[PDB]
């Protein structure tokens, strides 16, 4: 009954969220051959070795100075005091020549990742964004294509094929020898994943009536949350990415074995002013949600606890949104939730160096504020719009959010090379501008 739908909804989350755990770009530094023998001969410490050799740029600039440059010093020659060998050769180390990492890099982690496996750092750092770009392109292409298959064959036949293709693609990607095969498998997996999720949700909506639509939507949200919580536990005992990929892919194959028209909304001056605002708000919130998730995943100092806390705090938002239905209007919660997601960004920009106690609270507040705003849009959509919803919604809204999601990773990851806080200003501006447009929704000349 509901168990299969809950399992499918839970298993959909890892496909979209596993970028945080699969590639986590641990700390790295340049490798110089011949230093191991000298270090082991007059051994002093295994953690302070880089303080005397590896270049460092504490104040700033460490991206391309301490992680992509090495000292071209003949360490083989036995002329050193094993305390300050560079000082003995010359009192000024600033004028020493530099160079590229001709051999490779050594990383600091007990597990492994894609970045560690393929040495995907330094001048190749832009290559990690392709991982999400290909998935989002597959999401865009699948939405316009899976509709044809359902009409060609049927709703029942397509689900088994999509599930089988997804299950095979997961294992094949787990057994990928080079980078290009990984990208192809990611594209195929994203396409089929969106297709089967769409088909399953449409079938579920067909089976369930509109009397308990709110209840089933809340159940789906909680199923997504609980599926996302259990992913943190699996990654704790399986540090290697191949094992984690196999464990995530296995259970899917395990349980496997005078009419309302779209042209009427753009001729009446009253209805034409509402749909545009609805699309604008949906696109804005869809962009900010993924932006903040990726930003938190790319700079967290404690990944597991922060992920768990955010997932837990995401739950009461749905309850609050359901409670506040019959007491007040619909623009006050929207405006308050949209304003709560900007001031959090402004504060996060200006947080002085402190502990992590404030950061978790502020991130949870922002996540709850974003979560509240999305539910209200869905409730209003269901309340005010005619019988034809499903197809036009899941097509137009998906194609609108996918084009933003294709470009979001490039902006998020490539705007931190000049300043670390630039995407935060963009998020703040988007949040503050999204709150000032909802005030035009009320109709004028309305007297009780």
């Amino acid at each position: 009954a509901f168990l299969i739908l809950c399992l499918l909804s839970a298993a959909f989350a890892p496909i979209c969220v596993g970028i945080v755990f699969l590639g986590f770009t641990p700390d790295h530094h340049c490798q110089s051959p011949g230093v191991a023998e000298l270090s082991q001969r007059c051994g002093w410490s295994p953690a302070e070795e880089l303080n005397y050799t590896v270049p460092g740029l504490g104040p700033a600039g460490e991206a391309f100075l301490g992680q992509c440059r090495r000292y071209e010093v003949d360490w083989n020659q036995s002329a050193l005091s094993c305390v300050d060998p560079l000082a003995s050769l010359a009192t000024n180390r600033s004028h020493l020549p530099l160079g590229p990492c001709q051999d490779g890099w050594v990383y600091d982690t007990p597990g492994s990742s894609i970045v560690t496996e393929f040495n995907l750092v330094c001048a190749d750092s832009w290559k990690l964004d392709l991982f999400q770009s290909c998935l989002n392109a597959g999401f865009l292409f699948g939405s316009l294509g899976v509709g044809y298959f359902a009409d060609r064959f049927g709703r029942k036949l397509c689900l088994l094929g999509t599930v089988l293709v997804n299950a095979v693609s997961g294992v094949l990607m787990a057994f990928s020898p080079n980078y290009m095969s990984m990208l192809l498998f990611r594209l195929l997996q994203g396409l089929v994943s969106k297709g089967n999720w769409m088909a399953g949700y449409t079938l579920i909506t067909e089976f369930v009536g509109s009397g308990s639509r709110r209840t089933v939507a809340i159940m789906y949200q909680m199923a997504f949350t609980v599926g996302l919580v259990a992913l943190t536990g699996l990654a704790y005992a399986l540090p290697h990415w191949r094992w984690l990929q196999l464990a995530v892919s296995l259970p899917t194959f395990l349980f496997l074995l005078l009419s309302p028209s779209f042209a009427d909304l753009f001729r009446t001056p009253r209805l034409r002013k509402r749909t545009f605002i609805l699309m604008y708000l949906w696109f804005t919130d869809s962009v900010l949600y993924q932006g903040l998730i990726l930003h938190m995943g790319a700079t967290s100092g404690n990944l597991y606890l922060d992920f768990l806390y955010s997932a837990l705090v995401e739950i009461p938002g749905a309850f609050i949104a359901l409670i506040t239905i019959d007491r007040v209007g619909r623009i006050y919660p929207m405006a308050m939730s949209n304003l709560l997601a900007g001031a959090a960004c402004l504060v996060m920009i200006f947080i002085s160096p402190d502990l992590h106690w404030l950061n978790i609270i502020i991130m949870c507040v922002g996540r709850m504020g974003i979560t509240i705003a999305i539910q209200m849009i869905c409730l209003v959509n269901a309340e005010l719009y005619p019988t034809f919803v499903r197809n036009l919604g899941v097509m137009v809204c998906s194609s609108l959010c996918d084009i933003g999601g294709i470009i979001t990773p490039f902006i998020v990851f490539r705007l931190r090379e000049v300043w670390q806080a630039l995407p935060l200003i963009l998020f703040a501006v988007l949040g503050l501008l999204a709150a000032g447009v909802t005030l035009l929704l009320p109709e004028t000349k309305g007297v009780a």
């Epitope: 005619p386 019988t387 009320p442 309305g446 009780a448």
Partner: nanobody, 118 residues
Framework: QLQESGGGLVQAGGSLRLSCAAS????????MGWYRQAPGKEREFVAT???????NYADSVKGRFTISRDNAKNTVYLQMNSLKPEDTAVYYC????????????????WGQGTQVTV
Amino acid sequence: QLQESGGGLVQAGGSLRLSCAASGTIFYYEIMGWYRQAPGKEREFVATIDQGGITNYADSVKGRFTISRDNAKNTVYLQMNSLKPEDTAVYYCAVPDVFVGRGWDYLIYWGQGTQVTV
């Protein structure tokens, strides 16, 4: 163009039906409802209905009024039975405003109603 019909004069108790008619654009894109005037008093609330089908009722009339929505004749119906002598007023078919106020207190349309007595 909201137009109401129905409403006679029952001797003492009974059942009767009220009907409201829309144009075709109001029917398919927003929320309808029924209000009461209660002459000698202020405006009152009796019921609503929306596209999905979720309905709300007033506290004083819960369990006595039934509202149903048609789809072929572009009309909305109201069913009431087991009346009381205090239930006499004119009934307005109105379109509330959802985004402002509380959700059912601000109006933008009405149809002048019709009178029924008990």
